[PDB]
Structure 1
Amino acid sequence: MSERPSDLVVNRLVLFVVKGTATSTHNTVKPLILLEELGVPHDIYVVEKVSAPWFSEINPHKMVPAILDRSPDGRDTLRAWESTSTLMYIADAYDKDGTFGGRNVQERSEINNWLTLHTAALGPTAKYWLYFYKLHPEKLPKTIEKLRSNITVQYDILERRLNEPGQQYLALKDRPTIADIATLPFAMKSTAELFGLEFEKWPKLQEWSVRMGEREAVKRAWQRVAGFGHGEKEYGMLE
C-alpha cells in the first residue's frame, strides 16, 4: 500500500502535471485547454516523481496528465489518465450542453472518429519517433525514417479533411471539439519543425493550427503549462 502527500486533498478537480519543459507539456496542455474553455474550477498538482507509489495508484501508466476529482455526489473520488481520457472525463462531467463533447449522436460520431485517429495514429507515431530519436540508447535511423514518413501520411489525412467545403475544424464545421484539442499539440509549426518537416506543405492544417492557437483558452493553457513548478512552489499543490 502507498501513502499520498499531506498536501494532496481533492476539494475540486486536481490536474497532475510535471515541471514545464519543451518535452513535458504537449499532453498535459490538452485537459488544461478544455478546463480553460469551460471555466472548470481546478487545482494544479506538480508531481516530483511519476514513479512514486501514490502516483502509480492514480495512473498505473505512471505519466501526466492525470486527474483526481470528486464524484458528482461529492461522496467519492474518481480518476482520469491518458490525455484523451482526461478530455473525455472533463467533457462528461463539466460540458453539460455538449459544446466540446458533441450535442447529439451525429456530432459525437465525427468527434470520436477524429479524437480516436489522434489517440491511435499521430499520437503514438509521434511518441515512438521522439523515443527512437532522443531516448533509445542506440540510433535506429531506418525506424526513425519510417515513423517520420508515417507522420506526413497523418498530416495528409488532416489536410484532406480541412480542404473539405466549410470544414473549419477536424470533427465539426462550426466549432472546435475535444478532437481539435487532442490533435493541436502534434499538428502545429513548432512540433512539425521538431520532426524535421516543413509545416507550410500542409497549408489548411497550418491555418487551422493558427485559428486554434488564437483562442484565449489555448493561449492561457500554453502560458500556464510552461510555468508549472517554476513559480513560488516547485512540487505539490500550487496556490
Structure 2
Amino acid sequence: SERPSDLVVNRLVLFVVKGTATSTHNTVKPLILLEELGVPHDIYVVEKVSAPWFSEINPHKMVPAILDRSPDGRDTLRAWEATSTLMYIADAYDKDGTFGGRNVQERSEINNWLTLHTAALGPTAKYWLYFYKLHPEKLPKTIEKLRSNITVQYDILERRLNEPGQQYLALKDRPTIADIATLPFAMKSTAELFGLEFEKWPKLQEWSVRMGEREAVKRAWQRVAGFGHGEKEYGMLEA
C-alpha cells in the first residue's frame, strides 16, 4: 500500500477518475466550490479506486476524496464522501460563510437541504445507476421503484422553489453547498438519463439553469469531463 511516486500534498489534492457522463456527478461537487472560492488545488486521476494505497485515503474506495495540509501546515488531513468534501472546503477556505452559512439561522437551512440530498436523492440516484448498469442481473421492478423515489425528491425540491422569493434551496439570496450538492442530480441531462421529463418540475428546471450560468459551475463541468483524457492519463495532473 505504498503511495505512487507523484502523490505529494503541497496544497489541496482532489482525487477524481477518468471523465465520463456517469463518473463526474460527485467529483464535480467539491470542484464547483474550489472554483467558486478560487482555492489553489491539484487534481489526481486515480486509475483503480480498489488500489490499497487509495483505501488508506478513503476506506469507502470512491472519488471524490481530498488530501490537504492542516491549517498550521505541519500535518495532513483527509475528506471523503462528496458532502464531506464540501463541508471540509467550506470549513478550511470559506471564512466569510458565503457558501457554508454566516450564522446559526443560515446553517440550519443549508444543513437541512444538504442532508436531504446526502440521505435521499444522492443514495437513491446511486442505487438506480448501480442496478441500471453495474449489477450483473437486470432487476427492473427495483430500478422502477428507485426511479419513482427520484420523482418524489424532485417534487420536494419543486415545492421549496415555489415558495415566495426562494431563488435557491437553502437561502433566498444566494447559492450554498446545499445547491452545489443537489445540482448534478437535478439538471435536464441527468433527468433524461433517469428517463424523466424535467419540464414537469418548472421551478426546479429554472433553478438548474440559474446554477448552470455561474462561471465557477461552467469551469467545473468543463474540467471534470477532461480529467484522464489529456497528455497524462493517470496520476498527478501538471499544474
TM superposition score normalised by structure 2: 0.99
SS of match in other structure, 1:90: helix
Where do 5+ consecutive residues of structure 2 fail to align? none
CA distance in 2, matches of 1:213, 1:5: 36
- Measured in 1, the distance between the counterparts of 2:168 and 2:77 equals 31
Q: Distance in 2 between matches of 1:145 and 1:9?
A: 44
SS at match of 1:15: strand
What is the CA–CA distance in structure 1 between the aligned matches of 2:11 and 2:44, rounded to whole Å? 12
Aligned counterparts of 1:94 and 1:6: Cα–Cα separation in 2: 28
Structure 1 outlier segments of 4+, above 2 Å: none
User: CA offset at residue 23 of structure 1?
Assistant: 1.1
Q: Matches of 2:14 and 2:130 in 1, distance apart?
A: 25
> CA shift at 1:46, angstroms?
0.5
The CA deviation string for residues 95-132 of structure 1, in whole angstroms up to 9 with x for no partner, is 00000000000000000000000000000001111111
Deviations 1:150-187 (A, max 9, x none): 00000000000000000000000000000000000000
Deviation at 1:231, TM superposition (A): 1.1
Displacement of 1:133: 1.1
Shift of 1:136: 1.1
Q: Structure 1 residue 39: deviation in Å?
A: 0.2
TM-score normalised over the length of structure 1: 0.99
Give the match's secondary structure for 1:43.
strand
Residue 138 of structure 1: how far off its partner (Å): 1.3
d(CA) in 1 for partners of 2:19 and 2:138? Answer: 27
SS of residue in 2 equivalent to 1:128: helix
CA shift for structure 1 position 202: 0.1
Q: Whole-Å Cα distance in 2 between the matches of residues 51 and 134 of structure 1?
A: 19
Deviation (angstroms), 1:190: 0.3
Distance in 2, matches of 1:235 and 1:128, equals 27
Provide, for residues 25-50 of structure 1, a one-character-per-residue CA deviation record: whole Å limited to 9, x for no partner: 00000000000000000000011111
The 3-state SS of whatever aligns with 1:35 is helix
What is the CA–CA distance in structure 1 between the aligned matches of 2:65 and 2:141, rounded to whole Å?
A: 34
Give 3-state SS (helix, strand or coil) of 1:9's partner: coil
**Larger CA deviation: 108-117 vs 133-142:** 133-142
CA-CA distance at 1:6 after TM superposition = 0.9
Partner of 1:25: 24
- Percent of matched pairs sharing the same residue: 100
- Which moved further from structure 2: 140-149 or 101-110? 140-149
2:68 is paired with a residue whose SS is strand
For residue 182 of structure 2, give the secondary structure of its aligned residue in structure 1. helix
Give the match's secondary structure for 2:19. coil
| RMSD (Å), alpha carbons | 0.5
The 5 Å alignment of 1:6-21 reads 6-21=5-20
Cα distance in 1, alignment partners of residues 149 and 210 from structure 2: 25
Deviation at 1:140, TM superposition (A): 1.2
Shift of 1:137: 1.3
**Counterparts of 1:135 and 1:88, CA distance in 2:** 29
What's the offset of the Cα at 1:69?
0.1
CA displacement at 1:144 relative to structure 2: 1.0
Q: Runs of 5+ in structure 1 lacking a partner?
A: none
Structure 1 position 141, deviation (Å): 1.2
Distance 2:129 2:76 in 1: 34
